[PDB]
Amino acid sequence: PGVSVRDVAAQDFINAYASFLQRQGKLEVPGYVDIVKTSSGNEMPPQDAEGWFYKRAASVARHIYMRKQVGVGKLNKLYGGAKSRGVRPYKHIDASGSINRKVLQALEKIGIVEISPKGGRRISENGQRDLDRIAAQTLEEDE
């Protein structure tokens, strides 16, 4: 019948693809990992922490598969949240740009995401095939 990433629930797909990237062990991890907060408006590093880069990579891979073109500022908008500014009211604050940039560069390196015309990054057909096969295995889990 055919499958796509739109046919699978987002949380289960992102978990499966992040575990697949961690088992494949060939994307990259930058080195200043487990030394960053992922947002200036955060207050702790991620709690997974032997990870969370495959999770962020799987999430933006699904996000680029959904959209046409995203750039780094779009992902900073997407992964930013409410900063508790102490005793003043909260505010939306964009996430760390270096994390998303290096995730996009590592996904270009592994060949899921390509650079796009009209700016930004686009999904590649190789990455489209990989994401569809991971979604097929994802809903293959429940048999």
């Binding site: 030394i35 590093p45 922490a49």
Partner: protein, 139 residues
């Protein structure tokens, strides 16, 4: 995951750097009990050391604890990025030391008293006990 059957070598006051670090909690916050270190620093340290952060503090045998303490007191030797530190650029010598001791209070007092010596406004306000970060002192 699965349930372990840990044994009664568990020690729940085991102390480091002149502070009674509590046990029977998670090590990162147990270490934040110490001066000079907080949640972020403790997580970084216990990450640089290969440690099970899903494990309490009365575990963590003493070689592990002392490896942790070595990382704490000499962090830059283990690729800690030196913007992470508190007393960065250190007007006594111009290096990046992390004050994690009662040295934190001693150096606080020394900074205040050198400001008093040079007769800085910040030091005079510290002397009188007022607010000094530029606040209204109407309330």
């Amino acid at each position: 995951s699965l349930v372990v059957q840990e044994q009664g070598s568990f020690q729940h006051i085991l102390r480091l750097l002149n502070t009674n670090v509590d046990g029977n909690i998670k090590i990162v916050y147990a270490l934040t009990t110490i001066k000079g270190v907080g949640r972020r620093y403790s997580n970084l340290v216990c990450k640089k050391a290969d440690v099970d952060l899903h494990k309490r503090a009365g575990e963590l045998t003493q070689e592990e604890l002392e490896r942790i303490v070595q990382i704490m007191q000499n962090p830059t030797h283990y690729k800690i990025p030196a913007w992470f530190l508190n007393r960065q650029n250190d007007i006594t010598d111009g290096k990046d030391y992390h004050t994690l001791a009662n040295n934190v209070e001693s150096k606080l007092r020394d900074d205040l008293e050198r400001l008093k010596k040079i007769r800085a406004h910040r030091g005079i306000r510290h002397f009188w006990g007022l607010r000094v970060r530029g606040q209204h002192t109407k309330t």
